[PDB]
Ligand binder design. Structure first.
Ligand SMILES: O=C1N[C@H]2[C@H](CS[C@H]2CCCCC(=O)c2ccc3ccc4cccc5ccc2c3c45)N1
Ligand SMILES: O=C1N[C@H]2[C@H](CS[C@H]2CCCCC(=O)c2ccc3ccc4cccc5ccc2c3c45)N1
Ligand SMILES: O=C1N[C@H]2[C@H](CS[C@H]2CCCCC(=O)c2ccc3ccc4cccc5ccc2c3c45)N1
Ligand SMILES: O=C1N[C@H]2[C@H](CS[C@H]2CCCCC(=O)c2ccc3ccc4cccc5ccc2c3c45)N1
Ligand SMILES: *[C@@H]1O[C@H](CO)[C@@H](O)[C@H](O)[C@H]1NC(C)=O
Ligand SMILES: *[C@@H]1O[C@H](CO)[C@@H](O)[C@H](O)[C@H]1NC(C)=O
Ligand SMILES: *[C@@H]1O[C@H](CO)[C@@H](O)[C@H](O)[C@H]1NC(C)=O
Ligand SMILES: *[C@@H]1O[C@H](CO)[C@@H](O)[C@H](O)[C@H]1NC(C)=O
Lengths: 122, 121, 122, 123
């Protein structure tokens, strides 16, 4: 069918996320449980909010979301595309930017990390 | 505090308006790009995001998604709101622009990266 | 047993590269055969030039290199780190930037793609 | 007529680099003096090695180089294009990846930072 974002996912790093119903404007909300973190602070489940692109109602749509971490001053944004193979196996191929907080504008240059994640269903 | 609400323009000439930021840090708005990857006519597009409220920083991090209404593509922006040495607010952001590809074997080439600096308009 | 860049490698996309000897300053040269390309033009083997970081002569050093494509106006740069496991299996975890040419500076914004690659020995 | 990498440059952060002659294969070397650093160590001038793309011998070519930092375990790679306006004013629009060292492969995910730089000539 269409590749749908709703439901439960895990990534190559062991992180989980659950996304709820996608409304008619493509808006969704959920939660994200990272399996990894940059430092010793305790991981807390964090909210995410995003949109799926609905133009031409593609069966493999692009999308993006923001994770607003509840245990860091940082923000991660993820963007990717939902693929589906002939057996109906779904996968999200994503890239992210992780923005840290810096105290001063002179340190902005070092504030942004980059990486990928591949998510498959639970 | 450096506040996301209001009207902004970037180094490329794009405009965006962000509304009120609620108690969970959620905001919505609209984005008018000045530039585009292809010939399709530009349309104003919704954005949705969140500002980080931990320690209620006067210069908080944030992120938002632009759900383009004239492309199959998605752009995500993340940055931090600074209050500059001239007293001006400025958003320093980096973005990932995801294009749609028909086949998973082409995924590798789908994601572009860049920056934008926004100032108030 | 240090993780050494010299020799023949293949990545998750099927691309091959062969790196020669790494000199005492960490400098190396080689060739890169991509398995994929952005367009229809025929792929040609292309030169690469790089450096491995030698500070503290780490057994898992960072490195970078430039691929000077011989069939495109484009350039790709890769940067990563060479890892080992105790049975001696080496792997390079890398991220790349692929710079396309544009014929007007007003189009610079779109010129740069980003991704990852994982290489293992042949 | 062509935008040439050789010579002395400075970027929006204040960093300087000097690039030497670009040979017929497009190979160059030089030195990089960052104005900024992620941590307290004293900044040391560092070698760079790169190539400019010569396909179709464009007057505004792409290029890339690696900076092998002499004061960190880290590596930076820069890639971009040399632009030249009608008065002959040159500028390098670049983007970079900064790879830090991590002790364990389980930390790889956090190792890579991203950003941009714009360089203009020093006469
Ligand atoms: O599934 C996935 N998980 C990872 C990737 C992309 S998002 C990433 C999780 C990041 C959570 C924040 C974090 O680890 C964290 C934790 C504690 C920090 C303490 C102090 C910090 C100071 C500056 C910057 C930080 C950035 C992230 C930090 C922390 C800091 N995919
Ligand atoms: O303010 C800022 N503006 C720029 C930067 C980052 S977001 C970027 C604007 C992106 C608009 C979407 C687009 O270009 C677009 C439009 C139409 C497309 C039609 C067909 C496409 C086919 C493949 C790939 C595409 C990629 C982007 C496309 C389009 C396509 N900052
Ligand atoms: O092993 C790996 N392979 C891939 C990844 C990162 S490097 C990439 C291979 C790049 C080959 C050059 C290319 O695709 C290429 C070739 C011809 C082009 C002609 C015209 C272009 C116009 C705009 C943008 C381009 C981008 C890449 C192009 C070409 C163009 N890892
Ligand atoms: O002109 C430009 N300059 C900046 C940008 C991109 S390259 C960047 C300079 C990087 C110098 C290395 C560095 O800061 C550095 C120095 C010491 C470090 C010690 C320990 C580290 C541990 C983890 C990560 C690091 C990242 C950079 C580090 C260092 C570490 N443009
Ligand atoms: C992901 O979900 C599984 C069970 O449904 C659980 O074992 C695992 O702990 C979860 N991951 C994280 C990082 O919480
Ligand atoms: C941004 O706003 C200014 C002032 O209203 C306007 O003149 C300009 O055309 C707008 N730009 C775009 C891309 O809509
Ligand atoms: C890489 O090497 C393998 C084994 O030698 C070979 O079969 C394959 O064709 C090579 N790939 C490319 C892209 O040349
Ligand atoms: C670069 O050179 C300029 C003048 O040539 C100098 O004023 C500046 O301090 C130098 N910057 C660095 C980082 O060395």
């Amino acid at each position: 069918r269409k590749c749908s974002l709703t439901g439960k996912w895990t990534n190559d790093l062991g992180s989980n996320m659950t996304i709820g119903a996608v409304n008619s404007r493509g808006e969704f909300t959920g939660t994200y449980t990272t399996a990894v973190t940059a430092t010793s602070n305790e991981i807390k489940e964090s909210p995410l909010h995003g949109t799926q692109n609905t133009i031409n109602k593609r069966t493999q749509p692009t999308f993006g979301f923001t994770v607003n971490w509840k245990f860091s001053e940082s923000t991660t944004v993820f963007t990717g595309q939902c693929f589906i193979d002939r057996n109906g196996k779904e996968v999200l191929k994503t890239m992210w930017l992780l923005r840290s907080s810096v105290n001063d504008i002179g340190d902005d240059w070092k504030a942004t990390r980059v990486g990928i994640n591949i998510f498959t269903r639970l």
